[PDB]
């Protein structure tokens, strides 16, 4: 009885997709990703949890005359990679970093068909940039930058109100990673976190503070 997949326009050529899962203890949790338009083509930034919602998402944009050109997953957790199986099965190119695919493989999960590495990677030159700030929420977490709109998708790295699930986190590295991110994208107009409302560049500073706070609490 989960809430329906939601698709809402955020800016010119940029949509937020929201899907939901049950997390025992915290109840239903919304997960935000993006869909970015490049001319008459669409790129998924993270996938929904399920094949079903991934298909609904894909069909929504196909039906509006956009070809799905690919998806990129910001980290290996299922809230970013849930639709990779379905997308691969439809021969839609999927993208994840080398680290992410290696974590998927280790966990017995289907991998993205295309991978990349390095600090900066242009999924679409001058339109969609993937940035690796270093380990934080997970060892592999990346963010996605849309220069034309100055929109940053933070995935699960951006945690302005609390760090959340620490199971796969690197609390020792997160502050340095968050410092690097804030310096890189301080001119962001909009910052889009995975589990809360859209904000501005202040979310970068808040994340840094939470990360610093988390590390201090771990050492005491």
Q: Which residues contribute to the site for Fe ion (CB under 5 A)?
A: 77, 156
Q: Concatenated DSSP letters for 33-88? A: EEEEEETTEEEEES--SSHHHHHHHHHHHHTTT-EEEEEE-SSSSHHHHTTHHHHH
Rounded CA-CA distance 211/142 in Å is 16
159 is catalytic: yes
Written as six digits, the tokens of 55 are 């298909």
Is 32 labeled as catalytic in the residue annotation? no
Interface with Zn ion in residues 53-82 (CB under 5 A): 79
Give just the sign of the alpha carbon dihedral 169, 34, 142, 208.
negative
What's the full length of the chain, in residues? 220
Closest contact distance (angstroms) between CB of 73 and Zn ion is 12
Tokens of 19: 């899907």
Q: Which of 71, 141, 194, 207 binds Zn ion (CB under 5 A)?
A: 194
Q: How far is the CB of 212 from Fe ion (least distance, A)?
A: 20
Residue of 17, 31, 32, 77 marked catalytic: 77
Closer residue to Zn ion (CB): 36 or 156: 156
Beta-strand relationship, 27-38 and 114-116:
unpaired
- What the block records as the tokens of 30 is 């919304």
Work out whether 142 is an interface residue with Zn ion (CB under 5 A): no
Catalytic residue selected from 32, 46, 141, 156: 156
Pick what 194 binds: Fe ion, Zn ion, none; C-beta below 5 to 8 Å, kind-dependent: Zn ion
Residue number with CB closer to Zn ion (79 or 129): 79
For the question of residue 156 being annotated catalytic, the response is yes
Q: Based on the shown chain and the rule CB under 5 A, indicate whether residue 169 belongs to the binding site for Zn ion.
A: no
Which segment (9-17, 35-43, 172-180, 193-201) binds Zn ion by CB under 5 A?
193-201
Catalytically annotated residue among 31, 75, 127, 182: 75
Q: How far apart are CA 18 and CA 182, in angstroms?
A: 25
Q: Confirm whether 79 is a catalytic residue.
A: yes
Classified as helix, coil or strand, 187 is coil
- Residues with catalytic annotation? 75, 77, 79, 137, 156, 159, 165, 195
Footprint on this chain of Zn ion (rule: CB under 5 A): 79, 156, 194
């Amino acid at each position: 009885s989960l809430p329906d997949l939601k698709i809402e326009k955020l800016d010119e050529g940029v949509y937020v997709h929201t899907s939901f899962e049950e997390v025992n203890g915290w109840g239903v949790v919304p997960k935000h990703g993006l869909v970015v338009l490049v001319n008459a083509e669409a790129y998924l930034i993270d996938t929904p949890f399920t094949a079903k919602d991934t298909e609904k998402l894909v069909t929504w944009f196909v039906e509006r005359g956009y070809k799905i050109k690919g998806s990129i997953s910001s980290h290996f957790h299922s809230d970013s990679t849930g639709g990779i199986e379905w997308l691969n099965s439809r021969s839609i190119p999927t993208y994840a970093s080398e680290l992410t695919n290696e974590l998927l493989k280790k966990d017995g999960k289907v991998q993205a068909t295309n991978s990349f590495s390095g600090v900066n990677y242009w999924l679409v030159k001058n339109k969609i940039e993937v940035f690796y700030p270093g380990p934080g929420h997970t060892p592999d977490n990346v963010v996605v930058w849309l220069p034309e709109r100055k929109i940053l998708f933070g995935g699960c790295f951006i945690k302005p109100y609390g760090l959340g699930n620490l199971g796969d986190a690197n609390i020792e590295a997160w502050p340095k990673s968050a410092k690097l991110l804030k310096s890189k994208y301080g001119k962001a107009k909009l910052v889009v976190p995975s589990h809360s409302e859209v904000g501005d560049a202040s979310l970068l500073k808040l994340t840094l503070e939470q990360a610093v706070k988390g590390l201090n609490e771990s050492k005491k």
